[PDB]
Design a binder for these strands. Structure first.
Ligand SMILES: [Zn+2]
Length: 675
RNA sequence: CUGACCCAGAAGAUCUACUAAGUAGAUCUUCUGGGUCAG
């Protein structure tokens, strides 16, 4: 067995006395071993004829798997039964039997929330010890806070039932939105009241060993200037002005559709303005249907082109011009392949007029982003000293990951790097996700003397996922809150590590400095909190809990009533009628389908399975997809592709999700498909 | 029964920017249901 260190025993001492404590310690010091020692001590203390039950909470699937493996390997000699339940192993055996027939259970919090809501698990008195991993998430409406709401409701209710001991592990408690030390202390007291903790455990008497184990890197700040001359922006701005004039020609009241004033090309404000203008122009209703459809389609096309131009400008701001030009070229290829009509022909011709000059400018070596030059210089200088350096690079968007991988591959001066890619799992409109096996494979590859020595990743590599030690951390316009600042800096635990922040905006550096001051405030508040008498702390925590319980008991609100009137669904691009709400059927309360032979004439299928589009020529707006249910193969529609119009009043409305649209939902009937 | 892949819903946290708490864009995570291939 592994020999515990002195500071690990110091951290575990308050928990071995039966107190609810929060354990704060740097990442990489071995808090999992501390939890193992606490669990071992807890299970052995019960007298003959009595047993204890331990539940461990993890927020991510890989963390859950690793913890289950570690616990099973550790406690198999003692004769304890260890199991785990998650999304991939939930609907197999009843949860109550699994809980009753085991000693140590590893869980994702949502499973326990679901089973507490259904009534499968009537109370938390079955467990004798609860362990929360990354316990700083116990706030607002997190599942951790739902479990703690159940716990606190049982506690402050007069029910004379035993309750488990609660242990939390974290590397940073955070300050919330505190500005001074008093507010930080108030926030930390609130967090302690959330977990019912009366002790905060830190390393005091064995600091030298911890500093010998975990090393804190040095933080640097680099500020660069923007491009002096930008012909790319000039050309795109001229095109954007021409498109705005074309839009104003058709709609004379364009400038009164939004209240945003003094908009500028290539900013988030302009994006918000154009989104609002798009949402305003898709509602216009006029007595003549053909001319209304013409105007609406024209405005749709104009606004879409303006939005794409703004996106290209932003991409060019944060990356090379080649990436923005490729983005525009892909959009224009899709537009050409997506219903070429006279307005689309005009827009495409106007773009091809300036395409040659755009391609000429982006290939000039003297127009490169200064941020890229600074990053290349940093990488060269760092890898010259240590050829065995391991690096991690943090970025904001999924497109930047691919752009920087391409730039690194194509850079003749960075031939010593082997980039790796790490993004999230969810699928976006422009990007596909990453599966768990792919992430695991790339993480296994990314190590010293391996296939990769530099990793480009989004915020997926912030928490939970384990990564080999890095001697270099680089932040590319990457600043968040104090918790994220502590988490990102903790990945460079190798001795002599450095952390760099790269930006061209002074506000980012100012915010990082404010974060560095907030960390000192938090440490001061924690140090002050430990000098109080425990009874006073208990009284304050009880008062906070009582107030919060009263507020949350008074906050509950009811649900309104849906509307039974019939409605029409119209194509969002061309305003053509698609179907009525009387034809809509719901499959298993989560799939929406349209029944009837009239709807089959309003769409066409173009090949996963085939999607469905608007049948009207030159529109081809996306409406949904074909799915398989039992024997039937039926299409499903998306509410965000249609405009909802009332039959009587005639007012048109927009919805983004099916739960916002309140109408009578008739369940799907297999035998109904005969009328 | 295991792996691998996809689709449709819903929930949560974080950041930025607007308006008079709400909204828009982005990032990550989780749960539920429906299908495909191989062994
Ligand atoms: Zn259409």
């Amino acid at each position: 067995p592994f020999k515990p260190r002195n500071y690990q025993l110091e951290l575990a001492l308050p928990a071995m006395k039966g107190k609810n404590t929060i354990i704060c310690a740097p990442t990489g010091c071995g808090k999992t071993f501390v939890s193992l020692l606490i669990c071992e001590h807890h299970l052995k203390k019960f007298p003959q004829g009595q047993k204890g039950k331990v539940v461990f909470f993890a927020n991510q699937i890989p963390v859950y798997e690793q913890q289950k493996s570690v616990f099973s390997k550790y406690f198999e000699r003692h004769g304890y039964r260890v199991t785990g339940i998650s999304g991939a192993t939930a609907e197999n055996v009843p949860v109550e039997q699994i809980v009753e027939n085991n000693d140590i259970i590893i869980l994702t919090p949502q499973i326990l929330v679901n089973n507490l809501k259904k009534g499968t698990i009537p109370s938390l008195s079955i467990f004798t010890l609860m362990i929360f991993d990354a316990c700083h998430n116990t706030s607002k409406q997190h599942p951790y806070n739902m479990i703690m709401f159940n716990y606190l409701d049982q506690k402050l209710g007069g029910s004379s039932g035993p309750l488990p001991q609660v242990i939390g592990l974290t590397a940073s408690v955070g300050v919330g939105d505190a500005k001074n030390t008093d507010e930080a202390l108030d926030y930390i007291c609130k967090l302690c009241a959330s977990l019912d903790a009366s002790v905060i455990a830190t390393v005091k008497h064995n600091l030298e060993e911890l500093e010998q184990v975990v090393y804190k890197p040095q933080k640097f700040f680099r500020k660069v200037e923007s491009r002096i001359s930008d012909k790319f922006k000039y050309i795109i701005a001229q095109l954007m002005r021409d498109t705005e004039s074309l839009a104003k020609r058709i709609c004379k009241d364009l400038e009164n559709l939004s209240q945003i004033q003094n908009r500028e090309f290539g900013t988030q404000k302009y994006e918000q303005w154009i989104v609002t203008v798009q949402k305003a122009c898709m509602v216009f209703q006029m007595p003549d249907k053909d001319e209304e459809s013409r105007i609406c389609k024209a405005l749709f096309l104009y606004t879409s082109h303006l939005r794409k131009y703004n996106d290209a400008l932003i991409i060019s701001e944060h990356a090379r011009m080649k990436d923005a030009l490729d983005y525009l070229k892909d959009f224009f290829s899709n537009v050409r392949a997506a219903g070429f009509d006279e307005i689309e022909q005009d827009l495409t011709q106007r773009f091809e007029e300036k395409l040659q000059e755009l391609e000429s400018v982006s290939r000039d070596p003297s127009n490169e982003n200064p941020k890229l030059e600074d990053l290349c210089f940093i990488l060269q200088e760092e890898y010259h000293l240590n050829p065995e350096t391991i690096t991690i690079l943090f970025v904001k968007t999924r497109a930047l990951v691919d752009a920087l991988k391409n730039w690194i591959e194509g850079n003749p001066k960075l031939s010593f790097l082997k980039p790796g890619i790490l993004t999230g799992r969810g699928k976006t409109n422009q990007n596909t996700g990453m599966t768990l096996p792919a992430q695991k494979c790339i993480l296994d590859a990314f190590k010293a003397s391996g296939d990769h020595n530099i990793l480009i990743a989004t915020s997926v590599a912030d928490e939970g996922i384990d990564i080999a030690q890095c001697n270099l951390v680089i932040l590319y316009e990457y600043v968040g809150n104090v918790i994220k600042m502590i988490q990102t800096r903790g990945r460079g635990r190798a001795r002599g590590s450095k952390c760099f922040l790269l930006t061209s905006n002074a506000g980012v550096i100012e915010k990082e400095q404010i974060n560095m001051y907030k960390e000192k405030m938090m440490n001061d508040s924690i140090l002050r909190l430990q000098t109080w008498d425990e009874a006073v702390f208990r009284e304050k925590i009880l008062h906070i809990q009582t107030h919060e319980k009263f507020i949350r008991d008074s906050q509950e609100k009811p649900k309104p009533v849906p509307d039974k009137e019939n409605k029409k669904l119209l194509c969002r691009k061309c305003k053509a009628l698609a179907c009525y709400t009387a034809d809509v059927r719901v499959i298993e309360e989560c799939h929406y389908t349209v029944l009837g032979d009239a709807f089959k004439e309003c769409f066409v299928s173009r090949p996963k399975r085939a999607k469905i589009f608007c049948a009207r020529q030159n529109c081809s707006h996306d409406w949904g997809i074909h799915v398989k249910y039992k024997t039937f193969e039926i299409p499903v529609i998306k509410i965000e592709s249609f405009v909802v119009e009332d039959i009587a009043t005639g007012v048109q409305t927009l919805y983004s999700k099916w739960k916002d649209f309140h109408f009578e939902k008739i369940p799907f009937d297999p035998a109904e498909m005969s009328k």
